[PDB]
Amino acid sequence: PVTTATLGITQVFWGLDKKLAQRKHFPSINTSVSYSKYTNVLNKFYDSNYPEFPVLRDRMKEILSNAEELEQVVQLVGKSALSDSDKITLDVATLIKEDFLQQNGYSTYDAFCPIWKTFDMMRAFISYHDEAQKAVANGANWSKLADSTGDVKHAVSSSKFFEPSRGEKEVHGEFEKLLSTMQERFAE
Amino acid sequence: AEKRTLIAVIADEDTTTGLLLAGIGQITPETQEKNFFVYQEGKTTKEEITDKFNHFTEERDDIAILLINQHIAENIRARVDSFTNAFPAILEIPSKDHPYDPEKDSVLKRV
Amino acid sequence: NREQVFPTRMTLGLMKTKLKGANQGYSLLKRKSEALTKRFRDITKRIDDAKQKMGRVMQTAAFSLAEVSYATGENIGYQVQESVSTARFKVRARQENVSGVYLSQFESYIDPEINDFRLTGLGRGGQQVQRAKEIYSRAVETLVELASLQTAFIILDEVIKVTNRRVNAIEHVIIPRTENTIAYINSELDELDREEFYRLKKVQEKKQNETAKL
């Protein structure tokens, strides 16, 4: 009753996911049941500082929602013959959950991820997803693209370790190299 | 599997000769055995035929498709029915003066 | 008939979501079984057609081999057995994805290192022996195709049996068990609500009696 009366007045909600907490995945924030009713008010600041933040945030939300929809069928049907695009989306979402969403609060590198670092990591992850979808649409088999772009996958998974103390100009340059490396590796 | 690239025939002498001319199998240098285990239906024994079929369909054999003439497979029909594994597949090749009958097809009987 | 889940509002929600998931999985697996059994019927038809084709091809190839043997004057069985050192015809397994199952389908392969034929040194009927070799090569190709068909048939039949077993299990065990569990949990929650109502009614009666006494 306390939370169902709170939800009527609160404008944000970060409901804890029991499954994500059992997996020792922190923060165990339920992505489906959480919300923030300032995502429309805060466009006045996103479009001024980081113009692409809303579109990429919606893209990540859509990817996670699609993965959540597909995971039920995966569990109920063994998931042997997913389409290449569906496999790419589910792998990208698993990577997002493991690297972007997961955050070791006590770790020195990920103690406080600044907004610019979060935006850059979102750029990297969405760019990986778009590159994977483009590769699948090119006709090449995702089973081979996995080995071909394992280097890029490890690079985006280790972009989490970019220490924010390096400075906004320095870190944003490091990410720009990673995205540049991403496009170059797309020739595989 | 990768090692499965081999074809085994246990048919009659004429069919075995024809398939050997086609070049189905090879003689193993280490095992001193060949996949072209020619065995007449009237010669040898039913126990020998069953043992050969078991060796070819089990014991980590490299045969992908087991070729048994309908006449010879009829005598080992119990073993053929028992061989319910997906691989290696078994076929009932017609034999001279012994045409293939749909009723004698063990695998087609599952329909 | 019912699970041992402790009746709570959270447990009721979890079990209702489980019932919805089980019903969705039942519909999905029933449709999958329908698609795979249509494909199974198609594969059975192709199996029958290929069986007739094999019945024809074996007869014609045996006739060709007998003609070659008659032309050569002796059976080529000894030469064929002697030339069995290496294999010229091999089958490479391919895990072709058909529908939602990775059915294994064979693909024939050949090598040039075993190009030797039994006609070498025969001295008679070389053209006939070569023609018989070509006919039996085509025959072996047809049998590899039929073996791929038959392996796909066996795999698909096994998967269809498993899927239909799961569909029937969901329809007759999981859905009845989960529905009974929902009914039991709802009844227990209603009983708890009734008990709380009685306790509050007793408190209200005591308060009203005290107010009247004042």
Chain C residue numbers with beta carbons less than 8 Å from the beta carbon of A81 are: 97, 99-102
**Which amino acid is residue B13, in one-letter code?**
E
Instruction: Say yes or no for a CB contact (<8 Å) between A72 and C97.
Output: no
Neighbouring C-beta atoms of residue A168, cutoff 10 Å: 13
Determine the Cα–Cα distance for residues B27 and B40; give it in Å rounded to an integer: 19
Chains in contact with B via at least 3 Cβ–Cβ pairs below 8 Å: C
Residue C20 lies in a domain: yes
Chain A residue numbers with beta carbons less than 8 Å from the beta carbon of C97 are: 81
User: Which tokens hold the place of B98?
Assistant: 């012994």
- Tell me the structure's resolution in angstroms, rounded to a single decimal: 3.5
User: Which tokens hold the place of C24?
Assistant: 């969705």
Chains in contact with C via at least 3 Cβ–Cβ pairs below 8 Å: A, B
User: Which tokens hold the place of C26?
Assistant: 């039942």
Give a three-class secondary structure readout of A86-138: HHHHHHHHHHHHHHHHCCCCCCCCCCCCCHHHHHHHHHHHHHHHHHHHHHHHC
CATH for C84 = 1.10.287.3240
Determine the Cα–Cα distance for residues C8 and C94; give it in Å rounded to an integer: 52
Neighbouring C-beta atoms of residue B98, cutoff 10 Å: 17
Chains in contact with A via at least 3 Cβ–Cβ pairs below 8 Å: C
The total number of structural domains that make up chain B: 1
Range of the domain at B45: 1-111
User: Which tokens hold the place of B110?
Assistant: 């599952």
C102 touches chain A (CB under 8 A): yes
Range of the domain at C120: 9-213
Neighbouring C-beta atoms of residue C20, cutoff 10 Å: 12
Closest CA to A95 of A144, A177, A162, A152: A152
Determine the Cα–Cα distance for residues C153 and C141; give it in Å rounded to an integer: 18
Burial (CB count <10 Å: 0-12, 13-18, 19+), residue A71: middle
Closest CA to C141 of A83, B12, B23: B23
CA-based radius of gyration for chain C: 35
Q: How was this structure determined?
A: cryo-EM
Q: Tell me the three state secondary structure of residue B81.
A: helix
Determine the Cα–Cα distance for residues C102 and A78; give it in Å rounded to an integer: 12
Closest CA to C102 of B46, A79, A25, A156: A79
- The DSSP H or E segment spanning A164 is none
Instruction: Kindly provide the b/e burial profile for residues C113-135, where b requires at least 16 CB atoms within 10 angstroms of the residue's own CB.
Output: ebeebbbeebeebeebbebbbeb
Determine the Cα–Cα distance for residues A108 and A174; give it in Å rounded to an integer: 19
Report the residue of C28, C33, C39, C155 to disrupt the A interface, i.e. the one with the largest count of A CBs within 10 Å. Answer: C28
Residue C3 lies in a domain: no
Give a three-class secondary structure readout of A136-160: HHCCCCHHHHHHHCHHHHHHHHHHH
CA dihedral A68, A69, A72, A74 (to 10 degrees): -90
- Could you give the maximum distance between any two Cα atoms of chain B, in Å? 41
State residue C109 phi and psi, 5-degree precision.
Answer: -135, 155
Determine the Cα–Cα distance for residues C7 and C209; give it in Å rounded to an integer: 35
Instruction: Say yes or no for a CB contact (<8 Å) between B22 and C133.
Output: yes
β-pairing, B27-28 with B33-34?
A: antiparallel
A117 contact partners, CB below 8 Å, separation of at least 6: A162, A164, A171
Nearest-neighbour CA in chain A from C47: distance (Å)? 25
Residue C1 lies in a domain: no
Is-contact A40 A26, C-beta < 8 A?
no
Closest CA to A152 of A117, A133, A125, A114: A125
Determine the Cα–Cα distance for residues C61 and C137; give it in Å rounded to an integer: 9
The total number of structural domains that make up chain C: 1
Neighbouring C-beta atoms of residue C31, cutoff 10 Å: 11
Is-contact C1 A46, C-beta < 8 A?
no
Q: Which long-range contacts (CB under 8 A, 24 or more apart) does C12-16 make?
A: C12/C182, C12/C185, C12/C186, C12/C189, C15/C178, C15/C181, C15/C182, C15/C185, C16/C182
C29 touches chain A (CB under 8 A): yes
Residue C55 lies in a domain: yes
**Which amino acid is residue C71, in one-letter code?**
A
- Counting every residue written for chain A, the total comes to 188
**Which amino acid is residue A141, in one-letter code?**
N
Report the residue of C53, C56, C57, C150 to disrupt the B interface, i.e. the one with the largest count of B CBs within 10 Å. Answer: C150
Neighbouring C-beta atoms of residue B104, cutoff 10 Å: 17
String of DSSP letters for chain C: --------HHHHHHHHHHHHHHHHHHHHHHHHHHHHHHHHHHHHHHHHHHHHHHHHHHHHHHHHHHHHHHHHTS-SHHHHHHT-SS-SEEEEEE--EETTEE--EEEEEE-GGG---TTTTT-S-HHHHHHHHHHHHHHHHHHHHHHHHHHHHHHHHHHHHHHHHHHHHIIIIIHHHHHHHHHHHHHHHHHHHHHHHHHHHHHHHHHHHHHHH-
Q: Tell me the three state secondary structure of residue A70.
A: helix
User: Which tokens hold the place of A58?
Assistant: 């919606």
CA dihedral A131, A137, A140, A145 (to 10 degrees): 20
Instruction: Say yes or no for a CB contact (<8 Å) between A81 and C21.
Output: no
- The DSSP H or E segment spanning B104 is none
Instruction: Say yes or no for a CB contact (<8 Å) between B14 and C158.
Output: no
Question: Count of CB contacts below 8 A, A vs C?
Answer: 21
Is-contact A64 A93, C-beta < 8 A?
yes
User: Which tokens hold the place of A151?
Assistant: 């280097």
**Which amino acid is residue B58, in one-letter code?**
E
Determine the Cα–Cα distance for residues C2 and C182; give it in Å rounded to an integer: 9
Instruction: Say yes or no for a CB contact (<8 Å) between B89 and C139.
Output: no
Q: Return the bridge partners of B28, or none.
A: B33
Chain C residue numbers with beta carbons less than 8 Å from the beta carbon of B35 are: 87
Neighbouring C-beta atoms of residue C140, cutoff 10 Å: 26
Instruction: Say yes or no for a CB contact (<8 Å) between C77 and B26.
Output: no
Chain C residue numbers with beta carbons less than 8 Å from the beta carbon of B15 are: 58, 62
Q: Return the bridge partners of B9, or none.
A: B36, B67
Interface present between A and C (3 or more CB pairs within 8 Å): yes
**Which amino acid is residue A4, in one-letter code?**
T
Neighbouring C-beta atoms of residue C194, cutoff 10 Å: 10
Instruction: Say yes or no for a CB contact (<8 Å) between B89 and C114.
Output: no
Instruction: Say yes or no for a CB contact (<8 Å) between C62 and B96.
Output: yes
Tell me how many degrees the CA angle B62-B68-B72 measures, rounded to the nearest 5.
135
Chain breaks in chain C (C to N over 2.5 A) after: none
Burial (CB count <10 Å: 0-12, 13-18, 19+), residue A66: middle
Of B4, B20, B94, Cβ closest to residue C80: B20
Report the residue of C51, C119, C136, C156 to disrupt the B interface, i.e. the one with the largest count of B CBs within 10 Å. Answer: C136
Report the residue of C89, C113, C130, C155 to disrupt the B interface, i.e. the one with the largest count of B CBs within 10 Å. Answer: C89
Of A73, A77, A80, Cβ closest to residue C102: A80
Interface present between A and B (3 or more CB pairs within 8 Å): no
C205 contact partners, CB below 8 Å, separation of at least 6: none
Tell me how many degrees the CA angle B56-C146-A83 measures, rounded to the nearest 5.
105
Nearest-neighbour CA in chain C from B76: distance (Å)? 20
